[PDB]
Ligand binder design. Structure first.
Ligand SMILES: [Zn+2]
Ligand SMILES: [Zn+2]
Lengths: 48, 49, 49, 145, 343, 45, 48, 68, 95, 317, 49
């Protein structure tokens, strides 16, 4: 499958039980689409 | 026991030209190279052919 | 049948092997291949099955 | 390398010695929506072979729990405030304006809160908007003897 | 198996793990590395002799070939990160030169294979008569199509330059590894008896690999872990003397594994380092009449520290002492080999 | 032309491209390249 | 010794030769060994 | 390889404190306590210049530019 | 942005969360100690979201009389006076 | 909301309760007692000593030629680790290069050191003695050869105190005939929290003064045992005409918390070991940079400065 | 054993009567037991400790 990374995994107690850490390489490299509407144009502007 | 260091350093600076310092590594490799020596000498190939 | 048997570690470091070279490996294309020892039934000893 | 919390561990059945986990990312919005709602970690709190809970706090947290709940532990003002706050961590999780505390279990001649008082303080500061207080009686693991 | 101190205090599965996993330490594969064209070699920049060592470890002469380092391991569950078999790594020690791995990847290039058939030897290394790009080619590749010695390479960049004779247009092959590597030596492997062109190059890339979060470490009893957070040096615990323990192991990991041999090793190390001894730890020496623990403890109380091995440690972030004392030993952490390539 | 090293004898051999590689005195069949003067920077980390 | 000699049935002061001969009779067959080990592990688990 | 300047746990400098340690075992007939004359009181900065393999002097005898 | 007030502050500015950037326990702990010597404060504890990113969440709950900003100001002045006393005695010690 | 009414802040009472004494002070080591200070301030003083105060160190290293055995990145690292003697406040900070990166050096920011040694064969050696100090000239690349290069104004700025390496005898690399090292190291200012090589003081740490008190006075040979447990000097056997032998705690500052007694079966009743909660015993051993007096003074100075910083940036709001 | 420990030290070496490597294989008799045949083995490609 595309859009799916993989790594060896260390523990962290500080984040949450919900949340998961994501290293910078996965963040900067894992992409997903976002439609652009009236009210989040500002965010996508900053993004690009 | 104590750290053999002065022997280590003196073997490092000028390697021993007499005999390989740690003989038991050779006695560990002994099986293979002795089988091959027994190939060449001690008449192994000759008997076969 | 090699040119290193009995050579004292000085004559080894003067060549390009490491002092306590142990030898025992056939070299093939540069990847030192070796014959694992296997285990066989006992020689000549008439056993039951 | 990614980072997770101890809690989920006993579910994924990893020892975190250096084993590795696939991270996926559903692209569209239908998929991530149904995922976020049906399969959000807390919403899988009961393993479905039986009813018993499969998540939980683990080794350090549990024995330090036996050391904090124990009646022999007393905290002053400074340590109590600091510890309660470290437990809550409001802003990043959110939801609250100002934290509320309990009065000290023993007061004179020095003000010393007790540990179980702090576990109760946490249970309070996560109280829902208007839900009546919890009550429970159930056997612990460490036998009393 | 013999060179695992106190090998007779461990639950045999753990001695089995430590055996099978010591055979993969990132240790010194020898001393002649300039003349080894092997594919992937690992060298541990700063290894040192174990302070606890079974005398056979000197007899077989391993000291030529050390495997790992000696870390002041404080058994403690303080950071909170080091649970579930992981551990920590004191950042100051991690930057002052703890196990500082160096990978060697020697990749070879052979124009002999790529010629189709028929026409004679065609391709050669270098810059064919004609122009060459300036932007990266002339930066890296010297003049002979052989790269500058020691220039840092990034994935998208050439390593060797060869050209067909017919088209006369230089081809290129880039460094297909995805991690900044260096170049140490390039060997122009002559073909044979003689009278031939350079038909093979051998470029030995020296990747550098410091301990990155995930790089497994291991004591000599089966406690393979992960470097989890690289905790800052000032936020670590500390004793009445001042030594920040360099690597924090987890207490909840010793039961359910039966590696009490490791605690014994801690005692032995803190004894050996103090006086200047090399504590003999061959299996089966110390019998039930007098425990090994008692002997090493006599040694320690001689040196000045507590007799069970304990030591009083003040925490780092609060400044007050830990109510109960803590355990500090001197263990041998033969670093493992699984860090970034696998991950 | 470049400068190399005989692997065994260690002698500068100055071979030019499209040539018979060999040690001009040894008969050996391997040559290392030598590191020239080059300005590289490395952070002290 | 007590448990084993009891399972085979001979006394504790038994003759060594007859004891050994019985034992030899014991573990050529294999089911009697399961009996012996049941009894022996019984006594040992008691001691433990 | 070379002595690990600035020992791991503490921050003391021990670079120069090996070539003057080695010529104590060498010619003073002393034991491992020799290093105590060097000013190493802890036992972190003491498991550095005691049990360090100087594995360079066995490696520098490999110059390719031997000229011999 | 050294100190920025996080968005949970009550309108009365009675329960504010300072967020000091580029700082760790080194100042957080001692500042908390000095603040707790102040009677009119009800709650003052410090935390860190994640040690990698150097952000220290502070937090002060105060009595209705004085707002928390003035409390922090006085606490910082008091910590400075503490260091003043320490340096005074210290530099008196040696010649 | 409960304050206990004895925790009131009062600068006069605090300043009066505080006491400092300096046991020993040398050019390198300093041991002194602070007292009347709560734990957190001791933790802060220790932290600022280790982490926060600045000191020059070799950040960048430009190699022009390095054919030595030692890996190049290893050699740059190990050069960086050496310490340099220059009062770190005579310089400014280094504005780090964002894009637009080259023109980022000035005479106040960075100082340059340079070394170069080519190990050439020494022929005067009679026989084979691989010292190798005698077989080869310039064999061991020392630290003392890192000879500073003045950059303009600096030649008169630091004329009174030359910017030199702290220890002229550290080993940096090792050579044999034929190879060479040639490089220049750019040294800048640094804050220890980023990297350890900046931290001026190697070892700065404290102990809470132990307290030994004998509940029931021991007798006779047990006096020998009790003197023998703790290290020398801290336990005297009292010359008392009544009876024959007892033991009392002379001076505990030398003692370690080792807790040897409490293991004994018979002693456990007779002695406790506690800790004076407000007596703090600092030890600070410098590395090569500055007199530890200046270290501690500048450490509390740095705390003062960071408090001023947060104070002003608050005053803005 | 006797002739071997003689062969090590001073006594001259004649052809070894019984070679040290030999393992004399006495198989005792017993009911329902391994068949008893005295086994005097003298070949290589075995294990010897
Ligand atoms: Zn040649
Ligand atoms: Zn140290």
């Amino acid at each position: 499958v595309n859009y799916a990374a993989r790594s060896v995994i260390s523990p962290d107690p500080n984040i949450e039980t919900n949340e998961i850490g994501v290293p910078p390489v996965f963040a900067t490299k894992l992409t997903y689409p976002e439609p652009v509407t009236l009210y989040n144009f500002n965010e996508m502007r900053n993004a690009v | 026991m104590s750290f053999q260091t002065l022997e280590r350093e003196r073997t490092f600076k000028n390697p021993p030209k007499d005999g390989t310092s740690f003989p038991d590594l050779q006695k560990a490799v002994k099986p293979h190279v002795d089988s091959f020596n027994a190939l060449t000498n001690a008449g192994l190939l000759n008997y076969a052919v | 049948r090699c040119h290193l048997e009995g050579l004292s570690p000085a004559e080894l470091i003067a060549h390009k092997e490491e002092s306590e070279e142990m030898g025992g490996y056939f070299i093939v294309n540069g990847i030192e291949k070796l014959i694992r020892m296997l285990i066989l039934p006992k020689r000549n000893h008439p056993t039951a099955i | 390398t990614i980072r997770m919390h101890y809690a989920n561990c006993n579910s994924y059945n990893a020892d975190f010695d250096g084993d590795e986990m696939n991270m996926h990312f559903p692209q569209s919005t239908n998929a991530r929506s149904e995922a976020q709602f049906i399969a959000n970690t807390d919403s899988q709190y009961l393993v479905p072979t039986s009813g018993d809970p499969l998540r939980g706090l683990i080794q350090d947290h549990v024995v330090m729990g036996v050391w904090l709940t124990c009646k022999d532990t007393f905290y002053t003002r400074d340590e109590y405030q600091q510890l309660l706050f470290q437990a809550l961590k409001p802003d990043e999780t959110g939801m609250y304006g100002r934290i509320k505390t309990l009065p000290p279990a023993i007061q004179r001649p020095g003000i010393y809160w007790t540990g179980k008082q702090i576990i109760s303080s946490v249970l309070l500061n996560l109280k829902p908007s208007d839900r009546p207080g919890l009550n429970l009686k159930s056997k612990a693991k460490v036998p009393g003897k | 198996a013999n060179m695992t101190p106190f090998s007779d205090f461990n639950q045999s599965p753990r001695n089995m793990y430590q055996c099978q996993m010591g055979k993969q330490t990132m240790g010194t594969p020898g001393t002649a590395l300039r003349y080894r064209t092997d594919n992937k070699l690992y060298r541990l920049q700063t290894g040192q002799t174990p302070v606890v060592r079974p005398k056979l470890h000197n007899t077989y002469g391993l000291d030529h070939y050390p495997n790992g380092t000696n870390a002041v391991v404080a058994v403690i569950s303080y950071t909170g990160y080091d649970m579930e078999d992981a551990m920590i790594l004191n950042k100051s020690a991690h930057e002052r030169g703890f196990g500082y791995g160096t990978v060697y990847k020697g990749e070879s290039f052979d124009l002999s294979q790529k010629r189709r058939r028929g026409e004679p030897v065609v391709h050669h290394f270098g810059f064919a008569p004609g122009s060459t790009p300036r932007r990266e080619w002339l930066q890296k590749l010297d003049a002979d199509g052989l790269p500058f010695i020691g220039i840092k390479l990034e994935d998208g960049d050439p390593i060797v330059a060869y050209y067909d004779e017919s088209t006369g247009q230089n081809f290129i092959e880039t460094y297909h590894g995805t991690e900044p590597g260096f170049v140490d030596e390039v060997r122009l492997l002559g073909n044979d008896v003689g009278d031939s062109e350079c038909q093979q190059i051998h470029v030995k890339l020296r990747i550098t690999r410091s301990p990155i979060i995930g790089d497994k470490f291991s004591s000599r009893h089966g406690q393979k872990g992960i470097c989890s957070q690289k905790w800052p040096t000032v936020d670590m615990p500390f004793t009445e003397s001042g030594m920040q323990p360099d690597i924090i192991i987890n207490p909840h990991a010793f039961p359910s594994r039966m590696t009490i041999g490791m605690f014994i090793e801690s005692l032995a190390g803190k004894a050996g380092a103090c006086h200047g001894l090399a504590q003999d730890s061959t299996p089966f020496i110390y019998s039930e009449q007098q425990t090994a623990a008692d002997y090493f403890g006599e040694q320690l109380v001689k040196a000045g520290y507590n007799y069970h091995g304990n030591e009083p440690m003040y925490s780092g972030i609060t400044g007050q002492e830990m109510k109960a004392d803590i355990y500090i030993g001197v263990v041998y952490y033969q670093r493992l080999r699984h860090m970034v390539s696998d991950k | 032309t470049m400068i190399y090293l005989c692997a065994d004898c260690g002698a500068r051999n100055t071979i030019q491209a499209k040539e018979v590689i060999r040690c001009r005195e040894c008969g050996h069949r391997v040559m290392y390249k030598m590191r020239t003067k080059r300005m590289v920077q490395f952070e002290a980390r | 010794l007590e448990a084993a000699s009891e399972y085979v049935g001979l006394s504790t002061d038994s003759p060594i030769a007859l004891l050994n001969a019985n034992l030899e009779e014991v573990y050529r067959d294999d089911e009697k060994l399961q009996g012996l080990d049941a009894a022996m592990k019984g006594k040992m688990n008691g001691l433990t | 390889m070379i002595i690990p300047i600035r020992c791991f746990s503490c921050g003391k400098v021990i670079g120069d404190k090996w070539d003057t340690y080695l010529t104590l075992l060498q010619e003073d007939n002393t034991e491992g306590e020799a290093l105590d004359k060097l000013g190493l009181q802890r036992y972190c900065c003491r498991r550095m210049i005691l049990t360090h393999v100087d594995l360079i002097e066995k490696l520098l005898c490999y110059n390719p530019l031997s000229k011999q | 942005e050294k100190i920025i007030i996080l968005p949970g502050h009550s309108a009365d500015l009675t329960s504010v969360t300072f967020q000091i950037q580029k700082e760790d326990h080194t100042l957080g702990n001692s500042l908390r100690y000095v603040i707790m010597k102040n009677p009119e404060v009800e709650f003052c504890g410090y935390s860190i979201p994640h040690p990698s990113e150097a952000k220290m969440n502070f937090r002060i709950q105060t009595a209705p009389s004085t707002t928390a900003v003035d409390v922090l100001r006085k606490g910082l002045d008091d910590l400075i006076d503490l260091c003043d006393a320490v340096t005074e005695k210290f530099t008196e010690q040696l010649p | 909301y409960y304050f206990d009414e004895d925790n009131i802040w009062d600068l006069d009472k605090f300043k009066k309760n505080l006491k400092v004494s300096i046991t020993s002070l040398d050019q390198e080591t300093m041991v002194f007692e602070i007292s009347g200070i709560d734990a957190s301030i001791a933790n802060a003083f220790r932290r600022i000593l280790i982490a926060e105060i600045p000191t020059l160190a070799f950040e960048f290293v430009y190699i022009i030629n390095n054919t030595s055995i030692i890996q190049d990145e290893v050699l740059s690292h190990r050069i960086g680790l050496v310490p340099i003697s220059a009062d770190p406040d005579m310089f400014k900070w280094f504005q780090h290069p964002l894009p637009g990166q080259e023109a980022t050096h000035t005479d106040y920011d960075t100082v340059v050191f340079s070394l170069n040694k080519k190990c050439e064969f020494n022929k005067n050696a009679a026989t084979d003695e691989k010292d190798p100090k005698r077989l080869y000239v310039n064999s061991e690349v020392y630290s003392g050869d890192l000879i500073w290069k003045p950059q303009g104004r600096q030649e008169e700025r630091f004329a009174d105190n030359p910017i030199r390496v702290v220890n002229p005898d550290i080993v940096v690399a090792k050579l044999r005939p034929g190879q060479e090292i040639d490089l220049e190291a750019h040294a800048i200012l640094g804050i220890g929290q980023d990297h350890a090589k900046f931290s001026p003081v190697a070892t700065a740490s404290y102990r809470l003064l132990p307290t030994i008190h004998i509940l029931s006075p021991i007798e006779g040979e047990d006096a020998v045992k009790f003197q023998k447990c703790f290290p020398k000097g801290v336990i005297e056997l009292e010359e008392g005409p009544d009876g024959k032998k007892q033991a009392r705690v002379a001076d505990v500052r030398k003692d370690t918390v080792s807790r040897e007694c409490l293991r004994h079966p018979e002693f456990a009743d007779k002695v406790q070991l506690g800790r004076v909660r407000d007596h703090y015993l600092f030890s600070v051993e410098s590395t090569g940079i500055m007199k530890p007096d200046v270290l501690f003074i500048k450490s509390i100075a740095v705390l003062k400065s960071k408090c001023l910083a947060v104070k002003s940036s608050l005053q803005n709001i | 054993i006797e002739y071997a420990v003689k062969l090590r030290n001073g006594t001259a070496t004649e052809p070894a009567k019984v070679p040290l490597d030999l393992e004399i294989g006495y198989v005792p008799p017993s009911h329902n037991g391994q068949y008893p045949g005295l086994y005097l083995f003298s070949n290589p490609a075995r294990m010897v400790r």
